[PDB]
Design a protein around this ligand. Structure first.
Ligand SMILES: C[C@H](N)C(=O)NCc1cccc(N2NC(C(F)(F)F)=C/C2=C2\NN=C(c3cccc4[nH]ccc34)O2)c1
Ligand SMILES: C[C@H](N)C(=O)NCc1cccc(N2NC(C(F)(F)F)=C/C2=C2\NN=C(c3cccc4[nH]ccc34)O2)c1
Ligand SMILES: Nc1ncnc2c1ncn2[C@@H]1O[C@H](CSCC[C@H](N)C(=O)O)[C@@H](O)[C@H]1O
Ligand SMILES: Nc1ncnc2c1ncn2[C@@H]1O[C@H](CSCC[C@H](N)C(=O)O)[C@@H](O)[C@H]1O
Ligand SMILES: [Cl-]
Ligand SMILES: [Cl-]
Lengths: 342, 342
């Protein structure tokens, strides 16, 4: 509904087909930091689950609902829109938990729950936190949340920071410059070079990297899942003013995210920062086609603007300038089509 | 509309969007054997192009049309359905060939040509030759071909041969056994192990391999583009009898393809065989659900049946038996969702 509204079928069909593969559920489950942190966040806040009713938004294999079960929940509604829902039902049976975990096929925007829930859990985070637009589904699900019900995760921080990394910049530039060739098999491609450069630099780069390449402390943008509304994520405007710690070419901004589970007994954090062990999300870098030259001490300022689209992703706009010189850089990146360098 | 009749809308949007990326055109152009052989086939049969009218079905960057121009063609209509058509137009301008190459946006099934052509050129071949179902477009284009006009390529051969590769087979289970564990964070996953096995076996494997895994001489299935009709590719039945040159466990069938340009001056071949240098098509392997033991001398017989679907691909059905023992196997595979092992 709300879902069909914001989503083209050519997208929502391809999307849920992807999460119908066991191997893709496996990719997430295998991420030990992710899965192990969720289990610990849930088991260590057992009072948040003991005898409670819970909703698992996008249960996939069902793994998070089993954690809720382990922690004493009385009833768990496990909503899943892809065919994976059937495999989850199989696991519920084979694990003898039919009396507590109830699989409900369909989009959380479109199904009905027999009752309101004390707590919603989900693992909706995408690359750069926001990709896939599933955070909106998670927020949407709050229509089933009892007053003063809890959200696991409770908040999310996106971090961005300027980086230098010229091996990357040049590896992407060299790819583009195939289209600079004046005589490919006798044919001059060079008029497209600009188009080429644009296309390659529109791809955010997903992989990890040494923290040494960061040139200033990260700026933080926070979403409070207890408080935000779906619509807060349609247009995300992240202003930044970095205070440069090193001089050098700025080749772009790197992004990563943390979420926190604020339970009654303790807060637990899941981080995908480059200072932390690798997760299946790696990190994300948006390159500038034309890097900015900065001296330690300069401030680099501008805006990262994320505009949600109907492909369950975002068009990313990044404008940055070195205040001291007036050197500007503007970029547009298409989060739907990442470059997996790893 | 012949095109839209046989194609799910979603599939076509994703399909043509893919070919709108310069980097994907580049993947084909960079394939030196592919591109180099096309140029040579065209330039060395220059009498087939000199002062002729040509149609380039799915011109992409336009590269093949420039080869027709280099060979003296008087007029070339370059048809292209993705947004790549715009970049091709830019190239035609920047190369000062607007008088000779005419880019026509749209599907070859849906556009109009001002005149009939002497020769159609195309590079429509997909994985396993037939993937993408673009050969039908190429055949469909013949409605513009003058009587006794030529097709470049003129014919295509698909080869299949039994292979033994014990590691590739067992790998399927090694992976699926991820699910065969009784307490994954406290959850017994084993009920899904079969599903995960079936999932991996439905994917054709794309990569190359050493020619020593092959256990018999290939069997050939030929399409004559001068003669075939679109409809001949809706249901492709390929019978096979292999005489086994080596004893061992057959784990599947390997596929590759060659096409021949039969020109007035000479016939030129493009081969993607494993005995030849690698191309961007690699080769394709379909595993048997369970291996079949054969002695050198025995015969392995059966049918590979390719059934086109509305996702611009095929459902692959393979049945095989060793005649001497009556041992038999079958597999069903989705050619639309290949596993890229390389
Ligand atoms: C929302 C959910 N909580 C979540 O974690 N979202 C992201 C997500 C979901 C499912 C799988 C993965 N992946 N993990 C890995 C591995 F190899 F590193 F293990 C690769 C991978 C791909 N492969 N292909 C993709 C991919 C490509 C393009 C757009 C995409 N949108 C979502 C995944 C994805 O990820 C990532
Ligand atoms: C029709 C045309 N003549 C033709 O050659 N068709 C096949 C084709 C067309 C365009 C690009 C490619 N590719 N080349 C490479 C490289 F890295 F090895 F260079 C990868 C690749 C992918 N990447 N992803 C795919 C892919 C995946 C799943 C379904 C698909 N259907 C078509 C391509 C494709 O190919 C292959
Ligand atoms: N609107 C929506 N309704 C229901 N499920 C959705 C949804 N959007 C995404 N999903 C599902 O949510 C899952 C995201 S990945 C998380 C899977 C699992 N909970 C785990 O933590 O391992 C996928 O299974 C996906 O198909
Ligand atoms: N029905 C159809 N009508 C027109 N173009 C089509 C088509 N089906 C596929 N194509 C186009 O055909 C191309 C196949 S790849 C070949 C591109 C270029 N001729 C080369 O040889 O490098 C793609 O650009 C694709 O979008
Ligand atoms: Cl996807
Ligand atoms: Cl595609």
């Amino acid at each position: 509904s709300v879902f069909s509204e914001r989503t083209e079928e050519s997208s929502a069909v391809q999307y849920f087909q992807f999460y119908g593969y066991l191997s893709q559920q496996q990719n997430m489950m295998q991420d030990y930091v992710r899965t192990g942190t969720y289990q610990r966040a849930i088991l260590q806040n057992h009072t948040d689950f003991k005898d409670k009713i819970v909703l698992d938004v996008g249960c996939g294999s069902g793994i998070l609902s089993f954690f809720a079960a382990q922690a004493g929940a009385r009833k768990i509604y496990a909503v899943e829109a892809s065919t994976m829902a059937q495999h989850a039902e199989v696991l519920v049976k084979s694990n003898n938990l039919t009396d507590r975990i109830v699989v409900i096929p369909g989009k959380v925007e479109e199904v009905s729950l027999p009752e309101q829930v004390d707590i919603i859990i989900s693992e909706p985070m995408g690359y750069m936190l926001f990709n896939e637009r599933m955070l909106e589904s998670y927020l949407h699900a709050k229509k089933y949340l009892k007053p003063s019900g809890n959200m696991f995760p409770t908040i999310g921080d996106v971090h961005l920071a300027p980086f230098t990394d010229e091996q990357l910049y040049m590896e992407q530039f060299t790819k583009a410059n195939f289209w600079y060739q004046p005589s490919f098999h006798g044919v001059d491609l060079s008029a497209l070079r600009g188009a080429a450069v644009d296309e390659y630099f529109r791809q955010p780069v997903v992989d990890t990297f040494d923290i040494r390449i960061l040139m200033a402390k990260s700026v933080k943008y926070t979403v409070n899942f207890l408080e935000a509304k779906e619509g807060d994520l349609h247009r995300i405007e992240i202003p930044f003013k970095f205070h440069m710690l090193h001089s050098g070419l700025v080749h772009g901004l790197a992004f990563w995210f943390d979420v926190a589970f604020i339970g009654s007994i303790m807060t637990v954090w899941l981080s995908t920062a480059p200072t932390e062990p690798l997760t299946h999300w790696y990190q994300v870098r948006c390159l500038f086609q034309s890097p900015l030259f900065a001296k330690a001490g300069d401030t680099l300022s501008g805006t990262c603007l994320l505009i949600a689209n109907k492909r369950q992703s975002y068009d990313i706009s990044i404008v940055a300038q070195v205040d001291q010189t007036g050197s500007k850089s503007s970029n547009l990146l298409d989060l739907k089509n990442p470059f997996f360098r790893y």
